Scaffold this motif. Sequence first.
Motif, short mmCIF file in Angstrom:
data_model
loop_
_atom_site.label_atom_id
_atom_site.label_comp_id
_atom_site.label_asym_id
_atom_site.label_seq_id
_atom_site.Cartn_x
_atom_site.Cartn_y
_atom_site.Cartn_z
N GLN A 7 0.84 -1.14 0.02
CA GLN A 7 -0.04 -0.12 0.03
C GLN A 7 0.92 1.45 0.08
OE1 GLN A 7 -2.91 0.10 2.90
NE2 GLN A 7 -4.23 1.62 1.72
N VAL A 8 0.76 2.03 -1.06
CA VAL A 8 1.56 3.15 -1.30
C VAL A 8 0.76 4.37 -0.77
CG1 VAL A 8 2.87 4.65 -2.60
CG2 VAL A 8 3.11 2.03 -2.99
N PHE A 9 0.81 5.04 0.22
CA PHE A 9 0.24 6.14 0.62
C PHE A 9 0.66 7.61 -0.29
CE2 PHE A 9 -0.73 3.10 4.05
CZ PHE A 9 -2.02 3.08 4.19
N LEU A 10 -0.19 8.42 -0.40
CA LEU A 10 0.09 9.66 -1.15
C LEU A 10 -0.01 10.78 -0.28
CD1 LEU A 10 -2.20 8.74 -4.21
CD2 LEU A 10 0.08 8.07 -4.05
N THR A 11 0.90 11.94 -0.53
CA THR A 11 0.85 13.14 -0.10
C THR A 11 -0.31 13.93 -0.33
OG1 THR A 11 2.55 13.91 -1.63
CG2 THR A 11 3.37 13.20 0.21
N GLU A 12 -0.70 14.87 0.55
CA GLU A 12 -2.16 15.58 0.33
C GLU A 12 -2.28 16.27 -0.95
OE1 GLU A 12 0.64 18.45 3.00
OE2 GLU A 12 0.63 16.28 2.70
N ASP A 13 -1.24 16.67 -1.67
CA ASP A 13 -1.47 17.45 -3.18
C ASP A 13 -1.92 16.25 -4.14
OD1 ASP A 13 1.30 16.39 -2.57
OD2 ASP A 13 1.35 16.79 -4.68
N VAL A 14 -1.43 15.13 -3.94
CA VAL A 14 -1.42 14.22 -5.11
C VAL A 14 -2.99 13.82 -5.16
CG1 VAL A 14 -0.95 11.92 -5.86
CG2 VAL A 14 0.87 13.14 -4.47
N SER A 15 -3.65 13.71 -4.12
CA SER A 15 -4.97 13.27 -3.93
C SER A 15 -6.09 14.16 -3.94
CB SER A 15 -5.06 12.18 -2.93
OG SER A 15 -4.67 12.86 -1.66
N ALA A 16 -5.86 15.24 -3.67
CA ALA A 16 -7.04 16.34 -3.27
C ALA A 16 -8.07 16.37 -4.37
CB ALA A 16 -6.15 17.62 -3.52
N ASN A 17 -9.25 16.14 -3.63
CA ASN A 17 -10.61 16.04 -4.68
C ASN A 17 -10.37 15.35 -5.76
OD1 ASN A 17 -10.50 19.78 -3.50
ND2 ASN A 17 -11.45 18.06 -2.54
N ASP A 18 -9.53 14.30 -5.63
CA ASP A 18 -9.48 13.60 -6.89
C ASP A 18 -9.89 12.21 -6.60
OD1 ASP A 18 -8.78 12.44 -9.26
OD2 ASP A 18 -6.72 12.72 -8.98
N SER A 19 -11.21 12.11 -7.12
CA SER A 19 -11.87 10.73 -6.78
C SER A 19 -11.10 9.51 -7.50
CB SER A 19 -13.38 11.00 -6.92
OG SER A 19 -13.53 10.85 -8.33
N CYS A 21 -8.22 9.23 -9.53
CA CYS A 21 -6.55 9.37 -10.07
C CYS A 21 -6.83 9.82 -11.27
CB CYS A 21 -6.11 8.38 -9.94
SG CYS A 21 -4.15 8.36 -10.01
N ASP A 22 -7.30 11.36 -11.44
CA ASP A 22 -7.36 11.88 -12.73
C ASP A 22 -6.77 13.22 -12.89
OD1 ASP A 22 -9.74 14.16 -13.95
OD2 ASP A 22 -9.09 12.21 -15.21
N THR A 23 -6.00 13.53 -11.76
CA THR A 23 -5.16 14.68 -12.06
C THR A 23 -3.79 14.47 -12.35
OG1 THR A 23 -4.51 14.56 -9.44
CG2 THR A 23 -6.60 15.74 -10.08
N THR A 24 -3.09 15.57 -12.75
CA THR A 24 -1.80 15.39 -13.41
C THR A 24 -1.00 14.56 -12.54
OG1 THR A 24 -2.05 17.53 -14.47
CG2 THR A 24 0.18 16.59 -14.39
N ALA A 25 -0.78 15.03 -11.22
CA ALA A 25 0.13 14.53 -10.43
C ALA A 25 -0.32 12.88 -9.95
CB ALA A 25 0.16 15.22 -8.99
N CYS A 26 -1.52 12.58 -9.71
CA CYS A 26 -1.97 11.13 -9.31
C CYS A 26 -1.55 10.20 -10.70
CB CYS A 26 -3.30 11.09 -8.95
SG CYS A 26 -4.06 9.67 -8.44
#
Length: 102
Positions: A7-19, A21-26
């Motif tokens: 399980q790889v946990f993500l920092t708070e920017d990667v996942s913000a409001n991203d249901s 994994c559709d954002t650039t960082a994720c």
Amino acid sequence: LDRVESQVFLTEDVSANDSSCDTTACKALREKIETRSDVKAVRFLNRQQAYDDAIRKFPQFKDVAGKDSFPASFIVKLENPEQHKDFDTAMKGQPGVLDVLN
């Protein structure tokens, strides 16, 4: 049955409001994981799912935890359980990775 998963946990920017994994960082991080030779499969758990899973096991946090105070993650299947040691190390050194469990 896979015996173990990472399980790889993500920092708070990667996942913000991203249901999903559709954002650039994720997406950038998912691609860095998925293209490793030692990775078989990857699925995403968003902040909402992380909240539900945590509060289920620890309702004590109900009054102090915001709906997004539980980090999102990738659940990763490796080709074999022996590959987890160096995978963990590599993942912990990736920008955007908070922690690795298992």
